[PDB]
């Protein structure tokens, strides 16, 4: 009946991203029982935080890779499109498929961090080998560190975000979501001196107001031209929850994350951006570099608790 | 005349700490004029953020070391007590005296970060060599990562925080503040297994409600017994603005910062904690370690603009 709580809500101010590998082996029934109790604790603490701090608009999801699926469940069918993002390594840099993603969103860092910290203490280092912990935060005017607004054409509202973000009702794994994460490191030393016309050509929208540059006036390699894709007259939209991260005086960029009803909607955009559809690359990739990457599936709340 | 805006306000949810060295040489008059124009831009942007985002309760201060004082001004007398923290290196680990501190506080990360980033871009790499950038955040119930409440006996309200936090009216450098920063790295694996009785003996207050343990029933090396000091019947109080920082699965701790009307109020507590008064160390130092340290002076708003 219900999805996990990171897909439909919009405009979170904070996000914590924990990605890593499961240390419990396939035959360890007691370890897997403890693992699933820690999953239940996560869902219970989400509800408790929502009750105590409604202003947080808290959300959270636990998501699983195709390689770990048969370790964590023998009951739930593996989502039919799920595969390792490492299969894209021949053309997309930075792939680093992990077993598990925990994504937590909030309008307050204190409750975002509380849920993240309590969850990591529950699972513990003996269950999860955490490879990446990212503290994302929204900036003024929802701008990415390129200083373009990020989110203008993100689908709005529960109806469209259910349509594009969640597996359809009646289908196997209904109300789950395919998930893609990818940490980008921005080269702002290179980007900042670029003329405004170059920056707008690169993105495909105007910088101040995020007005779309007419298709016939912007490069086919502009970011918007690379990612605004359709098949059979139907748009391949996705639900993005990306946030800025990092140090002003150090490494910084965009922690990209997308949720989708079909992995194909995400993968086709990756083929477009990274040169597999027409041999051409996204202009944005001259200024930013992906350094991690993973595909997951976030089960419905029911299937999460029935693994 | 008024102070810079990080001393009197309480209970900030976010703080950014930027510490580093001045690249402008004492002979470079045009570079120093540009440096002071960037100081002016900082004060103006604080006012503008305050107007646009009253909910941020924005605050900020630029602070100067004794070593850099006569580079940045030949007009304002050097504060009488200002000295390098490296003079404490014989007994206090982690000293790392820098020329400049910029401390920004907010109840929203987006405006905290906007002011910090805009300021760093104004000064630029040509003027500042940043050695440390810390993103502090308040946790639930204002608890330090030891999970004790941090702030119970901090002076409350404008009157007491002016008395203890700011140089007294009529004195040289009136309404400025002596500043001490010190980044701690916590060893929570050593702390978590201690029984509550040991944790409470270590701090000197109860954990759940921060009730003071009577002085004759706690060790003289408890943190409260080390820092609740007096001379001549006057309490050596300070104004703390410390915040947690760091990664759940990595390095984390407390970004300590104190403001005081007199550097001696801070230094006597450091002598106490680090064994220099009676040969005994603060019990808290079994569980956390300072890895940076600096003394500065935050001028009054008037003296900041008249450097
Ligand atoms: C450095 C990384 C990236 C940055 C800075 C970035 C930034 C942006 C910006 C500024 C926009 C325009 C405003 C908007 O409609 O949201 C945008 C649009 C979009 N981005 Fe990205 N993006 C990045 C990576 C990605 C990736 C990896 C994907 C796909 C997997 C993606 C998918 C999209 C989509 C679907 C749109 C909306 C296109 C439309 O229908 O008009 N982006 N991005
Ligand atoms: C890891 C570093 C530290 C931690 C976790 C820590 C934590 C705490 C806690 C839990 C309290 C009790 C609640 C309160 O009244 O605020 C406290 C009190 C205090 N701390 Fe610290 N503290 C640290 C470092 C320092 C340092 C370096 C100083 C001095 C330079 C300092 C000065 C004080 C003072 C003055 C008090 C109030 C004592 C009183 O009058 O009752 N602390 N600290
Ligand atoms: C789940 O417990 C909490 C969640 C959020 C807050 C914020 O006040 C406090 C909580 O426990 C004290
Ligand atoms: C590495 O030092 C810096 C990097 C970036 C900025 C502003 O974008 C400022 C820096 O130092 C002042
Ligand atoms: C566009 O400039 C601003 C927008 C929002 C804020 C705080 O929300 C501050 C701004 O400029 C200081
Ligand atoms: C290094 O990995 C961890 C460190 C600390 C915690 C919770 O305290 C969890 C970790 O991994 C799950």
Structural notes for this entry:
Chains A, B: It comes from Dictyostelium discoideum. Chains A, B: Residues 4-138 form the Dyp-type peroxidase N-terminal domain. Chains A, B: This is Dyp-type peroxidase family protein. Chains A, B: Heme b binds at residues 151-153, 223, 240, 256. Chain A has 307 residues and is α+β, with helices and mostly antiparallel strands. Chain A has one domain (1-307). Helices cover 29% and strands 22% of the residues of chain A. In chain A, strands 5, 8, 9, 10, 11 and 12 form a 6-stranded antiparallel beta sheet that branches. The first copy, chain A, has a 4-stranded antiparallel beta sheet with strand order 2-3-1-4. The first copy, chain A, has a two-stranded antiparallel sheet with strand order 6-7. In chain A, helix 1 packs antiparallel against helix 3 (109-123). The relative contact order of chain A is 0.22. The interface between A and B is medium-sized, with 23 and 23 residues. The structure holds protoporphyrin IX containing FE (2 copies) and Veratryl alcohol (VOH) (4 copies).
């Amino acid at each position: 009946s219900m999805a996990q709580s990171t897909v439909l809500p919009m405009h979170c101010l904070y996000g914590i991203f924990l990605e890593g590998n499961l240390k419990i082996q396939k035959n360890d029934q007691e370890g897997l029982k403890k693992f699933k109790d820690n999953i239940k604790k996560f869902t219970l603490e989400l509800d408790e935080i929502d009750k105590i701090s409604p202003q947080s608009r808290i959300g959270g999801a636990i998501c699983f890779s195709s390689d770990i699926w048969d370790t964590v469940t023998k009951k739930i069918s593996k989502p039919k499109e799920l595969k390792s993002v490492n299969t894209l390594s021949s053309y997309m840099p930075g792939t680093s498929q992990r077993d598990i993603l925990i994504h937590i969103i909030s309008d307050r860092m204190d409750t975002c961090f509380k849920l993240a910290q309590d969850t990591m203490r529950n699972f513990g280092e003996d269950q999860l080998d955490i490879k990446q912990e990212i503290h994302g935060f929204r900036r003024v005017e929802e701008r990415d560190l390129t200083d373009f607004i990020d989110g203008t054409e993100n689908p709005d509202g529960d109806e469209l975000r259910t349509q594009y973000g969640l597996v359809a009702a009646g289908q196997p794994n209904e109300f789950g979501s395919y998930v893609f994460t990818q940490r980008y490191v921005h080269n702002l030393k290179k980007w900042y001196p670029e003329p405004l016309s170059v920056q707008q050509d690169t993105v495909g929208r105007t910088k101040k107001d995020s007005i779309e540059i007419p298709r016939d006036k912007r490069p086919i390699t502009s970011h918007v031209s690379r990612t605004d894709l359709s098949e059979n007259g139907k748009d391949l939209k996705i639900v993005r929850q990306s946030l800025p991260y990092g140090q002003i005086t150090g490494e910084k960029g965009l922690m990209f994350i997308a949720y989708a009803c079909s992995l194909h909607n995400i993968e086709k955009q990756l083929q477009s951006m990274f040169g597999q559809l027409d041999g051409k690359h996204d202009l944005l990739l001259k200024y930013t570099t992906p350094v991690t990457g993973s595909f997951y599936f976030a089960p419905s709340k029911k299937e999460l608790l029935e693994l």
